[PDB]
């Protein structure tokens, strides 16, 4: 068969990922421009929300060294790929859990609906990639929202998860942090309540 | 804004390391036990950030100058350079390559690293570069040292530099580790050995590159990176 | 005082490097053009100094502590250890082993070295040890870096430590250079290549020695040294 | 045939030999005890002499980075092998040429006569080993004395040098340095007046 | 004016022939006995003449017509063609390639050649060509004959054509000799054997190229030329 | 390690180099445009000078079949790569030694000062490449000027030559030829007074 | 790298380990001297204690064929290697679980504090090696004491266990058995409450 050049293999991001990719989270000095966890300036269109969550290992213990990258549509269902700290909205961001702050946070807007390649609407989602010590190749998942139940029930991606019980692991829970709209999305890497992880 | 106009060759997850590689002890509790769920490529997966408009500092790619506290870092002066291409051999221009590492003694500039090898007051260990129009990047740094870690009772990481590469989409994004030609620690390392295929391990070994050295100044190593092959869509929804 | 009671196996000067090795440029004007004159062993050649009564300092063998100006040296912490034996396999006890080297960046603590890689304020690069009753020595140091030199226009010494060994007589005394397992600079070096026989080159390559490492602390390398075989005289002057 | 373990091969001592073997000559701090160029305390028996010389390459230029080791009998023709800084006399010493001091010196006594293995007297001599950048394996020679002409003419080692002209290269010349007895022994590594070098 | 913006890979002087190759007798007295002195590349070495505006005659590349005295030369009609590239595989466009040779009988058009094989009244043996925008050159000529020479008592040069190539700088300029596929004189020639490495000798052997022949007219040989790799400066004086 | 395509190996230019590269010197007909030994037309800015020299082998005998190529800055210290016979000045030229004329000549101007890559001025020099039968790969040298003693003393290239006596081999000697300023630069390929040759 | 002779590989002790190493527990005749579970005779200095425990597999079922070896300091914190049945105290002993007696017992004294190699005190502990059918290489653990909470908190060995919840698996529970001080130390080889096992 046709064999292309093999892809460079993945390795773990290791315990010091933050020194390269999360400088402030590493407690080290920052450069003039850093890719971080505030996707939306206050003037960005849409509903401004806080996302937060904790990451657990197979023993139920906190992962205190994880690194997360997110990618989402803006409120108008547009992916903003021209990354710029001066943008009202960036579709891309980064966050982390650390020894001092075991719970990651992201400041964003609720993403608008985008269609899959067959033209079927997907429920509002954030694409997440999770990296850490002990994780040899990053884990892909999606964060959906518990107040989009009708859309979620019809999502062609959620419907590829065979068991309803597993679909629930991807649904973030609406709450309030210091009185502001937030959604909590905890990730369980292994075992009871294991979060669905994707391949694509 | 971004559009869905391409597809990416599916990953070979037997070429990459598997999740559960118990000789690497931390992987035991941090590996999913359920199968990954395959999903088709949509705009969500086939797009991603481009960093052409991120403001880089003059020394962002130069670790000999980007943590300057009165002198040069101690250690083996090296250029680390290479090309980012996809599996079809096409260069990947204007893509973000980030890197980080320990100093010459194997000590990281992070609070959690308490190894007794000292910090270097003129070394931070962090770099970034955007590939040029032909897919090439380069950093100047010192060669990191190996270091011990709490895996088995006498385990040591080979000298390595972490790399992250964005590529054209979130589907292509990768983090890996670069190792150095001839290092006798490589065959012994349970993290290297998370990769089952010996040929895949070889793709992570940077080669000494005398052709690219600055005589009387610094050596050079070459590390080429291959991201998932990108093609146009064809015969979809018909 | 010393007595003539032994003979030493004649050297193989095709195993050693020859004098004239023009790729190593300085050898061109510093090699005799006349043949060496062979002379028989007498008391002058079969005796030599013993250093059992030389006063060694507590840190003479420990390069991490013997140039202490407020901290540890930067670089790869290593033990370099091994055994001195003769060609008959007999250990050489109570013999002087001296060593010196550049720091982690390939810079020597000497006025004449103007390489731009900085000096390390806590590293001197000099050690000595007397072998024990079983022929063993050990040093603790940092791994030296490679460095450029004015031979060809892009020539670089592999990482190396100089060794001098006295042995039982002036006939056995030797200076050599230790290189490190897997270093891709070794096959390229005109000084290494002054040795014509590839197997002789291998005898100068120290092997990574995990069995002798201090876990969470320092790696170890093993370098065994073989001096000329010593035998009793037999059937002389009859 | 019988093949023993091969000897560890020689390499050049290199340009920085002094940092390991001639610390004071390297301009670096010394340890409490160093092996150096004063073989005899003033109370040592015999005739106290200064030895000095310069080393030349094949172009007639000074070698300004050489390192020399010497081994000689005491005035009574005894080799003193128990090296000790407290000895009246040590049969072993070291000296060097450097950028600042191109001429090496040694402070010693004139060696007494020793016999070869056949019982034949050798003329008074100092055994010398020369090391330097550019010298892949050290060069052995002997320094004899011009005021021992009768002994020199009968030396069984000197007589192994086929040509009288080459024998002359090993004869040091009596002179006076600051009014004290000295012998100069220049070494020419290559070319005109090339010093005899030995193998044994 | 010319600018200093590039560097050229250092030559491998064990790949090229050494200066002193005594079986080629003339080299004995015309080889320096002191080592070459390495110097860093400056604008003096990294620039050179560009001959784009040198005015070539219509037949400067066609040795069948450029010495026309009433007829065609006698001998095997051939095209000699190829590409000039650097060690990175980059073509070298608009570069000067000069060539000269003996006639079909091994006789040169120079007063000093008194070989008894006659001159050809319609052959001069001299050509020049500027490579095109893709690095290609071509000449039309007759295949030169071998000839005897006063080296050993029965030494013969294989058939050969001299080539001079300017390239981008005085550092790339080269003269060499082209030989012909299959010639049994090649392995016997002390000038060929000035090159120690047999793989280097193979690089001077032009291959029969039927694909480039003019049927019913002339054969063709292919000779590609590789000049020193050229790169941009990086991390200098910082 | 990384191994590129190997360079095409050098071979000697041979005894008939002039037929291909020095047609007039070969006694053969010239083409309309030839690259020869007049780098400067009368009107070119700068000090007009005649250069001349002889080439000697290791037995001190004249080399009567040499081919030389030269590369030099204009009087203003700028290299002129656009080679054109209409130019008042070209930075490149060729000359030769032959059976009829064993002494090569060049007609040029004295080059201006050019900085090295580190910004340090080099003394005025002409780069020379020497080719001939018996020379397997061409020899690189530089011609400097005896009336530039101050600049020569500070030249970072001259100062890479370890021995002062060898630096003198690169210094051309000023004279007058028919009332015009000239310099002689003789080259000795081998042995006594051997000319310094460079690698770069 | 340097490769020594490989260690002889371990194999399971198998179901009949007691016939060879725990003769009385095997229901077989004993020899004059056996190594068994009474480390301390009545008169030995220190606090006399009974230790007991049960061993469980990954399904929570009793392991009724275990063999345990223990190594501990005397009450003064000194290891006593001279094994002799006449001693009031031995630092080494053996015990077992069997079909008739699923709970092992040891009769000993509480060990004194011993420093690690860095001079840091370790909390009082008994070293244990566990053997049985199904165990291919023996499992190492330590038994610490719940009435040594302050020392346990500062133990440099306990502190190498990353999770607090796992440290608790090594802490034996004080009780009284027939009015005598006792501690229970249960071992769970696999699964919920899995005992920490060491490599050294
Ligand atoms: Cl092409
Ligand atoms: Fe890691
Ligand atoms: Fe050296
Ligand atoms: Fe020729
Ligand atoms: Fe069994």
Curated annotation (Swiss-Prot), chains A, D, F, G:
Pathway(s) the chain acts in: Aromatic compound metabolism; beta-ketoadipate pathway; 3-carboxy-cis,cis-muconate from 3,4-dihydroxybenzoate: step 1/1
EC main group: oxidoreductase
Bound cofactor: record note: Binds Fe(3+) ion per subunit.
Documented EC number(s): 1.13.11.3
Organism ancestry: Bacteria, Pseudomonadati, Pseudomonadota, Gammaproteobacteria, Pseudomonadales
Protein name listed in UniProt: Protocatechuate 3,4-dioxygenase alpha chain
Keywords: Aromatic hydrocarbons catabolism, Dioxygenase, Iron, Oxidoreductase
Cofactor: Fe(3+)
Catalytic activity entry: 3,4-dihydroxybenzoate + O2 = 3-carboxy-cis,cis-muconate + 2 H(+)
Record-level Gene Ontology MF annotations: ferric iron binding; protocatechuate 3,4-dioxygenase activity
Biological process terms in GO annotation: beta-ketoadipate pathway
Protein role: Plays an essential role in the utilization of numerous aromatic and hydroaromatic compounds via the beta-ketoadipate pathway.
SUPFAM superfamilies reported for this sequence: Aromatic compound dioxygenase
Entries under NCBIfam families matching the protein: protocat_alph
Subunit comment: The enzyme is an oligomer of 12 copies of the alpha and beta chains.
Positions bound to 3,4-dihydroxybenzoate: 133
Family: Belongs to the intradiol ring-cleavage dioxygenase family.
UniProtKB/Swiss-Prot annotation, chains B, C, E:
Subunit-level organization: The enzyme is an oligomer of 12 copies of the alpha and beta chains.
Pathway: Aromatic compound metabolism; beta-ketoadipate pathway; 3-carboxy-cis,cis-muconate from 3,4-dihydroxybenzoate: step 1/1
GO molecular-function term, one example from the UniProt record: ferric iron binding
Documented EC number(s): 1.13.11.3
InterPro entries per UniProt: Intradiol_dOase_C (IPR000627), Intradiol_dOase_core (IPR015889), Intradiol_RC_Dioxygenase (IPR050770), PCDO_beta_N (IPR024756), Protocat_dOase_b (IPR012785)
Superkingdom to which the source organism belongs: Bacteria
GO biological process, one term: beta-ketoadipate pathway
Cofactor notes: Binds Fe(3+) ion per subunit.
Signal peptide: none
Entry similarity comment: Belongs to the intradiol ring-cleavage dioxygenase family.
Catalytic activity, reaction form: 3,4-dihydroxybenzoate + O2 = 3-carboxy-cis,cis-muconate + 2 H(+)
Functional note: Plays an essential role in the utilization of numerous aromatic and hydroaromatic compounds via the beta-ketoadipate pathway.
Cofactors that this protein relies on: Fe(3+)
Organism name: Pseudomonas putida (Arthrobacter siderocapsulatus)
Name of this chain's protein: Protocatechuate 3,4-dioxygenase beta chain
Enzyme class, spelled out: oxidoreductase
Keywords, sorted A to Z: Aromatic hydrocarbons catabolism, Dioxygenase, Iron, Metal-binding, Oxidoreductase
Residues the entry annotates as binding Fe cation: 108, 147, 160, 162
Phylogenetic placement of the source organism: Bacteria, Pseudomonadati, Pseudomonadota, Gammaproteobacteria, Pseudomonadales
């Amino acid at each position: 068969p046709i064999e292309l050049l093999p892809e460079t293999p993945s390795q773990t991001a290791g315990p010091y990922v933050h020194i390269g990719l999360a400088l402030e989270a590493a407690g080290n000095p920052t450069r003039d421009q850093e890719i971080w966890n505030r996707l939306a300036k206050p003037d960005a269109p849409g509903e401004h929300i806080l996302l937060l969550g904790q990451v657990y290992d197979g023993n139920g213990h906190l992962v205190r060294d994880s690194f997360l990258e997110v990618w989402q549509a803006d409120a108008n269902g547009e992916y903003q790929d021209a990354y710029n700290l001066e943008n009202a909205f960036n579709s891309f961001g980064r966050t982390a859990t650390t020894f001092d702050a075991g719970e990651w946070t992201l400041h964003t807007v609720k993403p608008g609906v985008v269609n899959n390649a067959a033209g079927v609407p997907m429920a509002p989602h954030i694409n997440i990639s999770l990296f850490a010590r002990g994780i040899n190749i990053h884990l892909h998942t999606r964060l959906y929202f518990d107040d989009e139940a009708q859309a979620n029930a019809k999502c062609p991606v959620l419907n590829l998860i065979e068991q309803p019980q597993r679909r629930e692991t991807l649904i973030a829970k609406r709450c309030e942090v210091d009185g502001k709209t937030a959604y909590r999305f905890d990730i369980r890497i292994q075992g009871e309540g294991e979060t669905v992880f994707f391949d694509f | 804004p971004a559009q869905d106009n391409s597809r990416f060759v599916i990953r070979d997850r037997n070429w990459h390391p598997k999740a559960l590689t118990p000789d690497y002890k931390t992987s035991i509790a941090r590996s999913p036990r359920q199968a990954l769920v395959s999903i088709p490529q949509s705009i969500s997966e086939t797009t991603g950030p481009n960093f052409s408009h991120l403001g880089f500092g003059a020394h962002d790619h130069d670790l000999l100058l980007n943590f300057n506290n009165g002198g040069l870092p101690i250690g083996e002066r090296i250029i680390v350079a290479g090309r980012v291409v996809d599996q079809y051999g096409k260069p990947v221009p204007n893509t973000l390559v980030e890197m980080w590492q320990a100093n010459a003694g194997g000590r990281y500039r992070h609070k959690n690293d308490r190894y007794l090898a000292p910090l270097d007051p003129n070394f931070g260990g962090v770099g970034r570069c955007l590939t040029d129009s032909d897919g090439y990047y380069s950093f100047r740094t010192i060669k990191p040292g190996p270091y011990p870690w709490r895996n088995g009772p006498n385990d040591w990481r080979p000298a390595h530099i972490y790399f992250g590469i964005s590529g054209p989409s979130i589907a292509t994004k990768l983090i890996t580790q670069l190792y150095f030609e001839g290092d006798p620690l490589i065959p012994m390392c349970p993290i290297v050995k998370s990769i089952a295929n010996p040929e895949a391990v070889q793709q992570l070994i940077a080669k000494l590159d005398m052709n690219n050295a600055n005589p009387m100044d610094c050596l050079a190593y070459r590390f080429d990176i291959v991201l998932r092959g990108q093609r146009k869509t064809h015969f979809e929804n018909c």
